[PDB]
Amino acid sequence: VIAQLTMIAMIGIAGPMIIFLLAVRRGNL
Amino acid sequence: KLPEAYAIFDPLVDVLPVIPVLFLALAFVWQAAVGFR
Amino acid sequence: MTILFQLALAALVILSFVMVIGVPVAYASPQDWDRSKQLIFLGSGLWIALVLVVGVLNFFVV
Amino acid sequence: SEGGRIPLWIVATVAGMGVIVIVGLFFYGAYAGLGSSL
Amino acid sequence: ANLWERFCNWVTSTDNRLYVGWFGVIMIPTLLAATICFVIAFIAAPPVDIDGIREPVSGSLLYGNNIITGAVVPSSNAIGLHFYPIWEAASLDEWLYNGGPYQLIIFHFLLGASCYMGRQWELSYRLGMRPWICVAYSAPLASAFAVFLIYPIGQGSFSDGMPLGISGTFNFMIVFQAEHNILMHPFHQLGVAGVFGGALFCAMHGSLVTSSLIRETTETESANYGYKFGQEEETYNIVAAHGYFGRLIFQYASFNNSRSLHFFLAAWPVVGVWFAALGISTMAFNLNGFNFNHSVIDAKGNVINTWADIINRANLGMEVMHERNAHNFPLDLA
Amino acid sequence: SYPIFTVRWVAVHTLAVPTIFFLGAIAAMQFIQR
Amino acid sequence: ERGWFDILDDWLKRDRFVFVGWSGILLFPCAYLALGGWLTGTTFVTSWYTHGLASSYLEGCNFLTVAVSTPANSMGHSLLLLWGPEAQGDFTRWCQLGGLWTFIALHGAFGLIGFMLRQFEIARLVGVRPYNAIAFSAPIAVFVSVFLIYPLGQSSWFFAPSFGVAAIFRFLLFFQGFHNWTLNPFHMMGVAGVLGGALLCAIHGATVENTLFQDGEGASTFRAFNPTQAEETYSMVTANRFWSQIFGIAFSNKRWLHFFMLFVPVTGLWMSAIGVVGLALNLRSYDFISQEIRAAEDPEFETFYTKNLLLNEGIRAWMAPQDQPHENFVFPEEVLPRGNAL
Amino acid sequence: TTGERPFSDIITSVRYWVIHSITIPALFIAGWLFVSTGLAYDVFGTPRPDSYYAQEQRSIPLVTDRFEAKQQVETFLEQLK
Amino acid sequence: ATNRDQESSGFAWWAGNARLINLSGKLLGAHVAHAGLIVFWAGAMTLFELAHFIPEKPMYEQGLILIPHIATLGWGVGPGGEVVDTFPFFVVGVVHLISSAVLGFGGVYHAIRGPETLEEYSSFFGYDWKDKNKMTTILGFHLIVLGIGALLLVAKAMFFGGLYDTWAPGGGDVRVITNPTLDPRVIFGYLLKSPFGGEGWIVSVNNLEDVVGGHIWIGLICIAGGIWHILTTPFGWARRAFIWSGEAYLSYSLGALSMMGFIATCFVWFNNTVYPSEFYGPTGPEASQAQAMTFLIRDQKLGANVGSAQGPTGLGKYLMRSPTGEIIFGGETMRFWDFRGPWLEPLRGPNGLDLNKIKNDIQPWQERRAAEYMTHAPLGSLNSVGGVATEINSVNFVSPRSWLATSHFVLAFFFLVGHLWHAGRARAAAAGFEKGIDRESEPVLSMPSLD
Ligand code: CLA
Ligand code: CLA
Ligand code: CLA
Ligand code: CLA
Ligand code: CLA
Ligand code: CLA
Ligand SMILES: CC1=C(/C=C/C(C)=C/C=C/C(C)=C/C=C/C=C(C)/C=C/C=C(C)/C=C/C2=C(C)CCCC2(C)C)C(C)(C)CCC1
Ligand SMILES: CC1=C(/C=C/C(C)=C/C=C/C(C)=C/C=C/C=C(C)/C=C/C=C(C)/C=C/C2=C(C)CCCC2(C)C)C(C)(C)CCC1
Ligand SMILES: CC1=C(/C=C/C(C)=C/C=C/C(C)=C/C=C/C=C(C)/C=C/C=C(C)/C=C/C2=C(C)CCCC2(C)C)C(C)(C)CCC1
Ligand SMILES: CC1=C(/C=C/C(C)=C/C=C/C(C)=C/C=C/C=C(C)/C=C/C=C(C)/C=C/C2=C(C)CCCC2(C)C)C(C)(C)CCC1
Ligand code: OEX
Ligand SMILES: [Ca+2]
Ligand SMILES: [Cl-]
Ligand SMILES: [Cl-]
Ligand SMILES: [Fe+2]
């Protein structure tokens, strides 16, 4: 159960991380 | 079950099918970041 | 061959994660596109190689 | 203190993720413990 | 212009008191046939063997029904999904016994009502309107398809289509509850939110526009004379309406944009009713309401009933009693 | 520049405060076994 | 005149995010408690002692099956006040006896009064006619007839609806099996007003949205409206022609159209309330006597009306022992009405 | 606008989140413990899973008397040994 | 940023993808990235199904929809549909999942990095929606692609191991199809069959020879049609009949997909050939017939004469006549007499169910199958409690047939809505009144009054 919630945490954050990294760097959003 | 060599990836495999739904939700995060302009 | 296999697959997973974040950020970032384009080329060739490695080693571990 | 420091799109994304987690837990609870029929 | 060209010009004429159009060319004859057959059957049809067990059910006024009990009764379970036009029967007497009028009526009706929907697009196009009134009508239409066609398909018989009658409708609902626990299905719940909400918002909108009508009349006349057909100026004060409703709740829960408000008025009932239709259309394939029967159990294993279990007892009553002579085997599988 | 404790502030907290308390309670319930 | 009353009036009527008013003094506590009581009960409170049911998240119910359930039948129509002779000030015992039911129903009722007073108060301040408050009389007639008058005509609050999703569904099916409520022309008028109201909501919204004037360059047309604009945003003339040609008739008067939108669902709800007042007394439209006389003498005579009564008889026999536990019903297998096989 | 601080100002400010990264989790945990300690059962009188029935009992503890209803419940509770 | 707000594009955020109508590069990205999503799901869902899969339980007891598709193609299964090798399932999943990365790569590239429009870059890849010839050429390419797809199925069936045949003599098994039906009378005859009971249009296809032959025809039709559309431009009558715009073409495809959705719904509900009951569970008709079969067997074992047993209504309790006289099972399943299945057919004679065969020839494998199907009828709750709506919690089951029929009805329905939405909008936009009525040129104002 701990292994499954860790995966969806890394996978879950990936999308919002992409946006965040781009917003910080004044990317082409 | 997956072949035994891949068993360690079971928890990852359990999560993968839901990933497409995350792309729809991502569109909203992105739009929120540009103020739904 | 299980040592080669199990880490090649972990390396495939890890690189995929790096690429998943890295490719779109690079594509949409204004500066350092020269350095980015080669890294993406490198990552892609390495990703493809690792797929083939896992694919071959599969049959010596299953 | 200053309004704007933490972008509204981050507050919404985090709050939204918080809602998904709690609702998700409630759905997990439909299959385990009390109310699970088991 | 040649004859065909002239005919086309008349069919598509924006000047006909009732628009005809190409959809109307199919709609008019099909709706007339369905209407005429329905009226005659409702008054004069003999009893119909709905459940294929030689137990004819009387639907017509002359055979002992009033407006509330009367129906055109669904075709025989012996027929199932077989196409039963008049010419497949050896006689009108046979056709009537087996519920032929039901099939004639619902097939002409469904065709005609689909063309009614197309005709709404068609006229909107001729008048230079936006095209989506027909999309709103797709909600009741989809609902009619669900109860007259999709449900019969899933269950394997037009004998399980909704009867064309007031009490027959209630029969369909009660049996549907027994067999699908529709009340516990989220698509029917969305349907209820759709129609309760539709009524709420209807009353709300009515009351708010009425409350802010601009004074144009005296007390000895209807305020309705304060509006003239085709006038350019709006007849109420939307700013006062929003000023009222925004204070009733809070500012940002009220619409200040009439286009947004009217879109919401269209969307809420239409989407809810689409879900209602889809509830029927998916319970047609026996994906049923939530089943929490014996979901709550104590430390020993005793069943602790919830309201779901009381619902279940009501459903059992319906189940065991419906079509009391039709089942020979222990499970009701369609 | 702006007040903090307003009628609105009170209204918000009469709802939000019990809501979070209740959500914690209901979360705990998901781990109760018969 | 500038006494404390007028100073209080000033503060109550301040233009704030959430308007208060004199009506707020009734509304806000009563609504808050009604809602709080429901959330409290559905989260933590049982129905074991009143109904023999679990009814809270604490016991394992979900959002669909949780309820605040009515008191035991033996309570009759007791106000069931916390300080009353039943609970005698004991909050725990009060919960176990169904005190939260009358708590929610009664604060709910006073809260609805407060809301309608709020509608009047705000209309008066803003200078509009009070048709919104007038329309709200329909929700009030429904709440009062169903949650108060109905159980008051019956043996006890036990037979009022319990505050819960599944519980309300049980209430619907009870009314079918026991009252044949579908057969009641007052319910039928209610149905027509609700469905007719939903129809009017959809058709009017769609008609306005599809007879819009082009007032902007955007393909998304919402921005091409201004609250303060004098002009109609859509064409009544084009709308009128469309419906006249499609359906045969059409509105031509906007004031009438909007009044009718009030009239239809409001009148429907009021009609359903009248029927429920009859049901309080078991004064049902249960039967057609002519139908029964014929069917009793003629075993070949069958209608959808006679079929539905068989369903009702099943509902009653199968649900009553668990639904009405105070009656201590024991119905041997052999007496239960059943068709063949099932 | 009605004079109160805009919500979007408030919930995008650092100070709001300094306060609420404490108060929100604090409330949630307090709610959790209200259940996990069993206090909820005691406050509301809700049966625990082992307290619906005595070991051999299959009859519901239905309240059957209006004015002695309190005592009846107390008697039902005693019979859980 | 070109065209990425409402002021410049004319489209609000919630209609944001309409900003892409005339930006062929970004729109290619959207499409390729989306194809990525489909391939991603196919791959990931398969791996998920495989990881959860217990080979000795029926697939239909396991919430599987993708493994059944692979198994029908003859991969991983043997006699009776028993799983003999899970490796083909693993391959299908992995290869889709890997392929999705590639598609996702191209999609993301075109969408955010590549040229926004393709016309200045290339005359071959660039397009104008209103360029009728270019539209039919691209359509032509895709028809050829689809024809090759259909022939891939033929190749699997004829040259690469065959398909799972529920009808195979002596029991269901993977079988090579050597004699596919080429006769156009049979193939196109399906297309002209009534969709009503006892006929069922194309859904009635009941043997793999017809299935494979159909795909030979469809493959050739699609390749020929593709070549046709590359080599021609639309005729005058077609030019005058249609709206020629991006949104119009979308609407035509939405209409088509809606139709296909409803067909697929009926296919999975009734057909047990290309949806073998071994993998998908019994059909509704099948399970109801299986119940009648079960109790006929039970009571006949006890000494009942099932031919002469009169039920409460006067109709045979176990056996009766259809309206054309065929001997069929009785009770409510009278409606399902058009059902056909490998476990039942051996009891069928020229006149329908044969009483002498029933009395003497029912084999234990038929009893087992009928009992299995009766107790896996496609009835169940949304939370997957198997059985009738009043059944108690115990069995975790909803038939794959129900999941697939309901989902595809919902999808087909909303796609009909999308068709109407976009067809009506395409018309209005082409004619120039999609944004509302011109106040100074209101058409109705120039029309005579109705009265
Ligand atoms: C305007 C807001 C409002 C209104 C209309 C109500 C109304 C009600 N409450 Mg609710 N309540 C409120 C706010 C409100 N409450 C608040 C803010 C709380 C939190 C403290 C509560 C907590 C609460 C509980 C726990 C209960 C109620 C209950 C009730 C009901 C019975 C009350 C009663 O009999 O009072 C009687 C008192 C009056 C009507 C006041 C009379 C004032 C007169 C005019 C002055 C005379 C008094 C005099 C000075 C005293 C001298 C006496 C001397 C001879 C000894 C009724 C529906 C009960 C119920 O719901 O049971 C099912 C119940 O158990 N309320
Ligand atoms: C291949 C199919 C297809 C394609 C390519 C398009 C493409 C387009 N549509 Mg059409 N549409 C379709 C099918 C399609 N649609 C269907 C099936 C319907 C019926 C509902 C519609 C109804 C529709 C309307 C009413 C409108 C469009 C519009 C548009 C344009 C803008 C779309 C946009 O930006 O959405 C942005 C996307 C969103 C805002 C997200 C929508 C959220 C959906 C409804 C919920 C998804 C539920 C999910 C499956 C399950 C729950 C998951 C959970 C996480 C929530 C674009 C040209 C607009 C237009 O007309 O421009 C010309 C417009 O106003 N479409
Ligand atoms: C299938 C879903 C889907 C797809 C494929 C697209 C595709 C696209 N959209 Mg639409 N959109 C969608 C759904 C989708 N949309 C929904 C649901 C909504 C409502 C919220 C919208 C609302 C919308 C608006 C308002 C607009 C678009 C626009 C666009 C285009 C440009 C986007 C941009 O400039 O990014 C900028 C964003 C970034 C640079 C952030 C990163 C984004 C990348 C693509 C994420 C990739 C993540 C992935 C995991 C990486 C894997 C890489 C790996 C394979 C190596 C692009 C072709 C724009 C357009 O039309 O421009 C002309 C536009 O204005 N969309
Ligand atoms: C054709 C589509 C389809 C079908 C038929 C199925 C079928 C099934 N799936 Mg699969 N799946 C799908 C798509 C589908 N899935 C998608 C898109 C994902 C990514 C999220 C998954 C990932 C997935 C996982 C991880 C699992 C399944 C599982 C299952 C099984 C149990 C399903 C269940 O319990 O539902 C529960 C029901 C719901 C959640 C309700 C859905 C209601 C939606 C939101 C309504 C949609 C309405 C409409 C489209 C929106 C339009 C809005 C309008 C305004 C325009 C069942 C066999 C389970 C299993 O048994 O695996 C072995 C399982 O664990 N699926
Ligand atoms: C529908 C799919 C599709 C289409 C029509 C295009 C079209 C285009 N691409 Mg994109 N792209 C795609 C998908 C697509 N791409 C995918 C999947 C990827 C990831 C691998 C990319 C990554 C990509 C990059 C990095 C670039 C392009 C570029 C181009 C342009 C020039 C291509 C060329 O000269 O080829 C000429 C032909 C060949 C080189 C030989 C093609 C060999 C193919 C692969 C053989 C196999 C075909 C087979 C039938 C495919 C079946 C796949 C199926 C299972 C899904 C053109 C606008 C270029 C660009 O836009 O310039 C600025 C460019 O730099 N593409
Ligand atoms: C995706 C598939 C596809 C699409 C979108 C098109 C699109 C087009 N085709 Mg092509 N075509 C295709 C595949 C396709 N084609 C294939 C596979 C072939 C080989 C058989 C052809 C051979 C072909 C020819 C010979 C012609 C076209 C023509 C056309 C144009 C007008 C078609 C039309 O008016 O249809 C509407 C259909 C009709 C008017 C036919 C009568 C309508 C009846 C009443 C409908 C009955 C069907 C009903 C729904 C029930 C179905 C079951 C039924 C069989 C019983 C248009 C550009 C024309 C063109 O201009 O060529 C350049 C033309 O002459 N196509
Ligand atoms: C195969 C694979 C993979 C993959 C991956 C991926 C592909 C991913 C992705 C991802 C993603 C794609 C993600 C995402 C996401 C997201 C999210 C998480 C979201 C969200 C959200 C929300 C929460 C929202 C909200 C909101 C807003 C924003 C606004 C308005 C309002 C609201 C509230 C609605 C990997 C590498 C692992 C490796 C192995 C295998
Ligand atoms: C009774 C009483 C009282 C009071 C109380 C109160 C006032 C309370 C409260 C309370 C409260 C105030 C509570 C709460 C809460 C809550 C909750 C529990 C919630 C929730 C939620 C949710 C879960 C959500 C979700 C969702 C939705 C619905 C929407 C959409 C989506 C979703 C799914 C997200 C007193 C003392 C005087 C006295 C005696 C009695
Ligand atoms: C444009 C756009 C969009 C979209 C996007 C997309 C739609 C995409 C995509 C994409 C994609 C579609 C992707 C992907 C991916 C993938 C991957 C990354 C992969 C991989 C894989 C792997 C790594 C594997 C592995 C393995 C093996 C080999 C075996 C067994 C186990 C395992 C699973 C571990 C949005 C809405 C945001 C908005 C803005 C714009
Ligand atoms: C594979 C297969 C097969 C085969 C198939 C085939 C051979 C087919 C087909 C097909 C087809 C061959 C089709 C079709 C079609 C068509 C259509 C779908 C159409 C349409 C149309 C339209 C839509 C139109 C329109 C219009 C009109 C009416 C008027 C004027 C205007 C317009 C132009 C708009 C079989 C069954 C043996 C078996 C199994 C498998
Ligand atoms: O037909 Mn009219 O309802 Ca449909 O489920 Mn089986 O079938 Mn009879 O029982 Mn129950
Ligand atoms: Ca235990
Ligand atoms: Cl019945
Ligand atoms: Cl039967
Ligand atoms: Fe209006």
Side-chain angles (χ1 to χ4, degrees), chain A residues 28-29, chain B residues 30-31, chain C residues 20 28, chain I residues 4 13 16-17 19-20 23 26 30:
Chain A
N28 191 26
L29 292 174
Chain B
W30 163 51
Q31 278 306 122
Chain C
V20 155
Chain I
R4 302 215 305 265
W13 69 267
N17 292 330
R19 301 172 178 177
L20 295 168
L23 302 169
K26 279 191 149 48

Side-chain angles (χ1 to χ4, degrees), chain G residues 3-233:
Chain G
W4 60 269
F5 176 95
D6 307 298
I7 298 300
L8 181 50
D9 190 80
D10 288 342
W11 187 87
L12 286 169
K13 299 174 170 161
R14 286 263 283 275
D15 204 10
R16 40 168 79 88
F17 190 94
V18 185
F19 177 84
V20 177
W22 286 97
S23 62
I25 298 161
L26 183 55
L27 170 63
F28 289 111
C30 288
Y32 184 60
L33 291 182
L35 180 58
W38 185 72
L39 295 156
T40 299
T42 54
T43 299
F44 296 115
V45 176
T46 195
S47 303
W48 193 234
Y49 302 104
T50 56
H51 284 257
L53 303 176
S55 52
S56 59
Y57 306 123
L58 182 54
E59 295 167 282
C61 291
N62 55 62
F63 167 73
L64 301 175
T65 67
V66 289
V68 175
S69 308
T70 48
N73 184 254
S74 60
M75 311 306 290
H77 308 99
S78 173
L79 289 165
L80 242 168
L81 310 179
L82 173 55
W83 54 87
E86 303 89 6
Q88 295 168 21
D90 191 317
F91 172 87
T92 301
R93 297 283 173 262
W94 185 66
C95 289
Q96 295 162 323
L97 300 175
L100 281 182
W101 191 91
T102 52
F103 185 88
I104 293 164
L106 297 173
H107 287 93
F110 285 99
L112 289 171
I113 296 178
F115 193 85
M116 198 166 154
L117 289 174
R118 172 182 187 90
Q119 293 168 312
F120 276 123
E121 188 172 21
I122 299 166
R124 187 62 280 187
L125 289 165
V126 158
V128 299
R129 314 155 92 207
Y131 287 88
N132 188 231
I134 291 161
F136 199 68
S137 75
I140 284 173
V142 169
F143 185 77
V144 171
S145 64
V146 171
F147 289 84
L148 298 178
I149 304 183
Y150 177 76
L152 283 175
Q154 297 290 336
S155 58
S156 71
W157 305 120
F158 182 88
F159 293 103
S162 287
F163 297 104
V165 168
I168 279 284
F169 300 155
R170 166 268 170 205
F171 190 80
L172 308 173
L173 302 178
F174 185 97
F175 271 51
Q176 180 51 48
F178 288 83
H179 298 304
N180 205 10
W181 173 227
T182 48
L183 203 80
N184 195 302
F186 291 95
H187 180 251
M188 290 164 172
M189 293 188 282
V191 174
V194 167
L195 295 188
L199 179 162
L200 285 166
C201 188
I203 205 174
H204 178 59
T207 299
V208 166
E209 282 298 283
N210 287 275
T211 55
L212 293 179
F213 284 118
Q214 187 181 349
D215 288 331
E217 302 306 317
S220 292
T221 60
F222 296 98
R223 281 190 187 176
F225 176 85
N226 195 306
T228 59
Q229 78 186 56
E231 308 87 2
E232 60 171 4
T233 197

Side-chain angles (χ1 to χ4, degrees), chain E residues 205-281:
Chain E
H205 186 64
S207 68
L208 293 169
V209 172
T210 301
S211 289
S212 54
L213 299 184
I214 294 149
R215 182 162 59 247
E216 295 292 350
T217 48
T218 55
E219 55 173 326
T220 61
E221 79 199 324
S222 172
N224 289 347
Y225 289 115
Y227 172 86
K228 269 33 162 277
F229 178 62
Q231 77 180 41
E232 282 167 2
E233 296 224 335
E234 201 34 277
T235 199
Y236 73 106
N237 185 338
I238 191 160
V239 174
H242 172 64
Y244 168 84
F245 183 53
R247 290 177 175 84
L248 184 58
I249 314 304
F250 55 83
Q251 178 173 188
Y252 307 99
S254 178
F255 290 96
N256 68 1
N257 185 326
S258 187
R259 301 188 164 198
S260 176
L261 167 66
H262 286 87
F263 169 71
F264 180 76
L265 293 182
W268 186 277
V270 167
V271 174
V273 170
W274 280 335
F275 283 110
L278 293 170
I280 301 298
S281 302

Side-chain angles (χ1 to χ4, degrees), chain I residues 28 32 102-103 105-106 109-110 115 118 121 125:
Chain I
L28 174 67
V32 177
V102 180
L103 296 174
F105 192 99
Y109 164 71
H110 285 299
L118 302 175
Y121 173 84
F125 292 104

Side-chain angles (χ1 to χ4, degrees), chain I residues 136 139 143 191-192 201 221-222 225 228-229 232-235 237-238 242:
Chain I
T136 53
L139 165 65
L143 283 167
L191 277 58
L192 304 177
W201 192 47
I221 285 163
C222 280
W228 166 260
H229 277 298
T232 62
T233 200
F235 296 128
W237 64 265
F242 292 97

Side-chain angles (χ1 to χ4, degrees), chain E residues 121-135:
Chain E
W121 160 77
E122 198 181 334
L123 185 62
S124 76
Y125 188 63
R126 313 305 185 209
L127 302 188
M129 281 166 57
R130 279 142 56 77
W132 300 305
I133 291 166
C134 74
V135 169

Side-chain angles (χ1 to χ4, degrees), chain A:
Chain A
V1 191
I2 304 152
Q4 279 151 352
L5 289 146
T6 315
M7 291 319 101
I8 190 70
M10 265 107 64
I11 291 159
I13 210 75
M17 193 56 57
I18 293 168
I19 307 311
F20 182 82
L21 284 166
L22 283 171
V24 165
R25 289 141 65 120
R26 290 180 189 171
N28 191 26
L29 292 174

Side-chain angles (χ1 to χ4, degrees), chain I residues 266-325:
Chain I
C266 295
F267 246 111
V268 74
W269 199 245
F270 291 94
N271 188 289
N272 63 0
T273 300
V274 295
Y275 297 91
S277 297
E278 293 95 329
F279 310 140
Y280 290 97
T283 68
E286 183 152 31
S288 170
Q289 294 273 280
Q291 178 172 229
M293 172 94 282
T294 294
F295 289 89
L296 187 159
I297 290 163
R298 188 200 68 165
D299 297 350
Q300 188 177 237
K301 278 183 187 166
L302 290 166
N305 286 328
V306 299
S308 55
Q310 172 196 358
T313 66
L315 284 167
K317 199 185 287 175
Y318 309 97
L319 297 166
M320 59 183 276
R321 294 188 177 268
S322 89
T324 44

